[PDB]
Design an enzyme around this catalytic site. Sequence first.
Site, short mmCIF file in Angstrom:
data_model
loop_
_atom_site.label_atom_id
_atom_site.label_comp_id
_atom_site.label_asym_id
_atom_site.label_seq_id
_atom_site.Cartn_x
_atom_site.Cartn_y
_atom_site.Cartn_z
N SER A 163 45.76 -35.83 -2.59
CA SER A 163 47.09 -36.39 -2.49
C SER A 163 47.72 -36.55 -3.86
O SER A 163 47.02 -36.62 -4.89
CB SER A 163 47.04 -37.74 -1.76
OG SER A 163 45.88 -38.47 -2.14
N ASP A 187 44.34 -47.94 -5.23
CA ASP A 187 43.36 -46.98 -4.71
C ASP A 187 42.08 -47.61 -4.15
O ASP A 187 40.98 -47.10 -4.36
CB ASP A 187 43.03 -45.95 -5.79
CG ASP A 187 42.33 -44.74 -5.23
OD1 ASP A 187 42.45 -44.44 -4.01
OD2 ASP A 187 41.67 -44.06 -6.03
N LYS A 208 52.51 -41.90 -1.58
CA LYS A 208 51.34 -41.05 -1.70
C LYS A 208 51.40 -40.04 -0.57
O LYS A 208 51.49 -40.42 0.59
CB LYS A 208 50.08 -41.89 -1.55
CG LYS A 208 48.77 -41.14 -1.62
CD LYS A 208 47.62 -42.13 -1.43
CE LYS A 208 46.28 -41.59 -1.89
NZ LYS A 208 45.16 -42.27 -1.20
N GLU A 256 53.94 -50.38 -3.21
CA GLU A 256 54.51 -51.03 -4.38
C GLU A 256 54.51 -50.08 -5.58
O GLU A 256 53.52 -49.42 -5.88
CB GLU A 256 53.69 -52.27 -4.72
CG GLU A 256 54.27 -53.18 -5.77
CD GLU A 256 53.29 -54.30 -6.18
OE1 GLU A 256 52.39 -54.64 -5.37
OE2 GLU A 256 53.41 -54.81 -7.33
N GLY A 260 45.72 -37.10 -7.33
CA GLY A 260 44.45 -37.62 -6.84
C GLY A 260 43.69 -36.47 -6.22
O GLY A 260 44.06 -35.31 -6.42
N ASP A 297 35.80 -47.46 -6.28
CA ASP A 297 36.20 -46.52 -7.31
C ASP A 297 36.97 -47.16 -8.50
O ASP A 297 37.88 -46.55 -9.07
CB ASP A 297 36.99 -45.36 -6.70
CG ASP A 297 36.96 -44.11 -7.58
OD1 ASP A 297 36.19 -44.11 -8.58
OD2 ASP A 297 37.70 -43.15 -7.31
N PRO A 339 39.31 -46.65 -15.11
CA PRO A 339 40.56 -46.94 -15.83
C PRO A 339 41.77 -46.30 -15.18
O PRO A 339 42.86 -46.90 -15.17
CB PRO A 339 40.30 -46.39 -17.23
CG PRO A 339 38.81 -46.47 -17.38
CD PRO A 339 38.24 -46.18 -16.00
N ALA A 340 41.61 -45.12 -14.59
CA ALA A 340 42.76 -44.49 -13.97
C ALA A 340 43.24 -45.22 -12.72
O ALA A 340 44.25 -44.86 -12.16
CB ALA A 340 42.49 -43.03 -13.67
#
Lengths: 270, 283
Positions: free
Chosen positions: A21, A154, A38, A91, A18, A136, A139-140
Amino acid sequence: TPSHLSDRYELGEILGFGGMSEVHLARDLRDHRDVAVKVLRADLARDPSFYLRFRREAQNAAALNHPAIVAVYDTGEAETPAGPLPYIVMEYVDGVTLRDIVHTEGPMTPKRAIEVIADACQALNFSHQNGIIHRDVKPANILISATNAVKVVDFGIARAITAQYLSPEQARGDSVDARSDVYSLGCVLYEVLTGEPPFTGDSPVSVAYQHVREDPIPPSARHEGLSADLDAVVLKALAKNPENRYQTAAEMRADLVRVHNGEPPEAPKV
Amino acid sequence: TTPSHLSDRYELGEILGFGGMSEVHLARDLRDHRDVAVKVLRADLARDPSFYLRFRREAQNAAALNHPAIVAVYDTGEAETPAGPLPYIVMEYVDGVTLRDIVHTEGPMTPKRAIEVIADACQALNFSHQNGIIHRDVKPANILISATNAVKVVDFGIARAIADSGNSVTQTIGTAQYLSPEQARGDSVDARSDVYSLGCVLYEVLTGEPPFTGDSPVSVAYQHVREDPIPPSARHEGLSADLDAVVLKALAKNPENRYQTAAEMRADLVRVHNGEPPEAPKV
């Protein structure tokens, strides 16, 4: 980054990178399960501007409880001899991103795309009814699990009152609200349907400019097996004026549901 | 925080400039005994595959052009240390500063100097075009002036596929000050775009500002699309109506009305430089 955090979480392979992170697959040695952790990139773990920015994101993480939203378990700060290393435990989803699916497999069938996006609408709606805008959606940030469930990750942290998935308002730098997540979800819908997002360009600026100023081309004009109805839905979600979009992710999902059924949607016919 | 060496051949020194994924280093070539410029993937983005892939493609497909006003490409490679693989490109080094630093520290040039500089940029872009290469990112930060005052253009876009349309296939929060209208809309970009962008630079070295400024890139992009640029001579003194005509032709909204080639623009810059009437509309 050390092999273990807090003598509890044993870091394994990277699930994704990311901004500042990186997310790891890990064993919670205490609860005996696999989790996602993360962390702040080890190099960045000394710039205080980043330590602080991350710790607020961690402390103030969106901890929502919904089947289609990746849960937040715990938050921490480990102790490498080099320094304190902050982290969020979440999770774990044994799966792949929409971004990967579209890229290795191409556009989905209309039926499958509808199932995926309507499920995302539920995550988004539950988030919205709890006061939280994702900001945000893209697709990612949508995961498909091995058993085929949609899991969204996210969410941005609550606020005071690239560019392929921005809404016109984020592009202008106006205020964003739930409707803004709606517009972005429609961008994703457009992409799983046609293999490409509504607007493409040589630079984020170009794309941003188009979001704000150019009319999207109806999906059926860019891929086959798409009905005029399905067009109308995507196009409504992509309305430039928030007042003209679906007002809620629920509204959007209901129109998706109608099209899955074969009933006419409440969306306008262009 | 990159390594001290690459391929046991290039030893890296001071950073000359940073870009998207990548940083440019002045380095000593230990085999050829000379100073080169080395563009490498930033070390912190190196574990990240989508950056490594994005850059490997850029490195392998780097535009090697052979021209005095173009910075040469010497080698393209991949170094393997415990942070790499790190694709990199080895380039001609220019002891100099960007046209951007110049305008920022020195202010606007004289027409005589502006013209000479842009005319040399034109020869670079023309050559490139005649070799099938469109720059796509012409802007002050990508034009260097050498210690001996030679113009040197960097950062050419890699060649892309053209579609059935006869249009270019698109590739890949920013400057937006040197964007053509076709770029803004995400339309086909070609030599005419470079011409327009170089127009913006010319406008900037002459007046101290690019044609359009604003508090969002989006809003600037819009001005490029919809709004007329104010003639340079209304923004700065010492500029003739003939010069205006040339700048404004380059800055025309419809590519069919700009200079069709960089050599054409150079031809009108040479005439103005000589005190001749330009081929461009009066305005």
